[PDB]
Write a protein that binds this ligand. Sequence first.
Ligand SMILES: N#Cc1ccc(C(=O)Nc2ccc(F)c([C@]3(C(F)F)CCOC(N)=N3)c2)nc1
Ligand code: NA
Ligand code: NA
Length: 379
Amino acid sequence: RGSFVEMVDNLRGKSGQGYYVEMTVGSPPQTLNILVDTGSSNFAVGAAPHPFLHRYYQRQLSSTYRDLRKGVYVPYTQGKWEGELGTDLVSIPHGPNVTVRANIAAITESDKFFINGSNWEGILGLAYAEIARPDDSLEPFFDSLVKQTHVPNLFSLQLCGASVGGSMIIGGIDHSLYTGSLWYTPIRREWYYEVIIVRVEINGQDLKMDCKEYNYDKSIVDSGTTNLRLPKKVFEAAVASIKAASSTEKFPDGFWLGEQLVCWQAGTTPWNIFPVISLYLMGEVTNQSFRITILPQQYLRPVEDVATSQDDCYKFAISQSSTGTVMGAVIMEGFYVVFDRARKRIGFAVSACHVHDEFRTAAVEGPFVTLDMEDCGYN
Ligand SMILES: N#Cc1ccc(C(=O)Nc2ccc(F)c([C@]3(C(F)F)CCOC(N)=N3)c2)nc1
Ligand code: NA
Ligand code: NA
């Protein structure tokens, strides 16, 4: 409990490409690098020589592979994969000292799914069976891990942004990875990691929307998405406040829609003109909330692969949503996040590794008094 030295720094990634962990599958073990995704629930790995893949799962080499004789077709909004379901023995080298028999979707065809140039070749869906494909009888990896071992039913994530890195602590919490205290919000339903946002402020100014708009139709914590996505009506109000707060400089319209980058001369990004963003989350106790606060360092993402600039370029990484609020790597990179599945709650603390400057820091503060927090959930 509280100290897992062998798991610290076991995540890697590149800007824009997500955070992955090394895993082994099959006997003898095949090493693969696997995207950590709290927004999905399948363990799915490339299993054919797609040209973007460094490595892929070769079932024929595994003596412990068992075929489930069942295919799966998984389309998303952007991209799709198709594959064949089986089980095999799985380990995490920089994780608990255990091996489990887990479901694996061996991906045999994909479109817009793998990233050309990335170093990962599969996804580890850490959410719940309710959103597993093809249905909820396909037990997710973490469920199998907990059923089959003595690993406690929780994991925690410290995502360190810009190469990027961080830590996934499986079965516990490591107190060296955060400062101050953890504050917990209830998991409202076990499918995604769904939470309820009760108030939103831009530089301390409340947006003053009906709080149900903040969770229309849900709000989730998702390490497999870069942006903070906000329901459309909330995005419109949020951008209008951020423009107002920032208006000592003028940016093109397209910038705010994520349609154009903005660039400054290296070493002089004026962080100080941009406001902080606070989300108040429902707390553990009736009429009690806490707030998490992020900086422009989290929501203005550096874009390095800009082959027609000099020069320091950023994308605005808050975007409109049709799927509810998505607290992606923009929120998560400020905090140490604890997915305390055993107590159905999510903890937030200030991350010991978050990017900040000498004037402002990310913050997790409470308790606040907020009434009618149950009306904020959308049904
Ligand atoms: N920071 C950061 C960051 C950058 C890229 C990605 C990424 O490419 N995810 C990804 C790629 C393909 C998918 F299909 C998914 C899905 C899939 F696995 F469900 C669907 C979209 O949302 C989620 N959460 N996962 C995620 N993730 C996180
Ligand atoms: Na167990
Ligand atoms: Na600490």
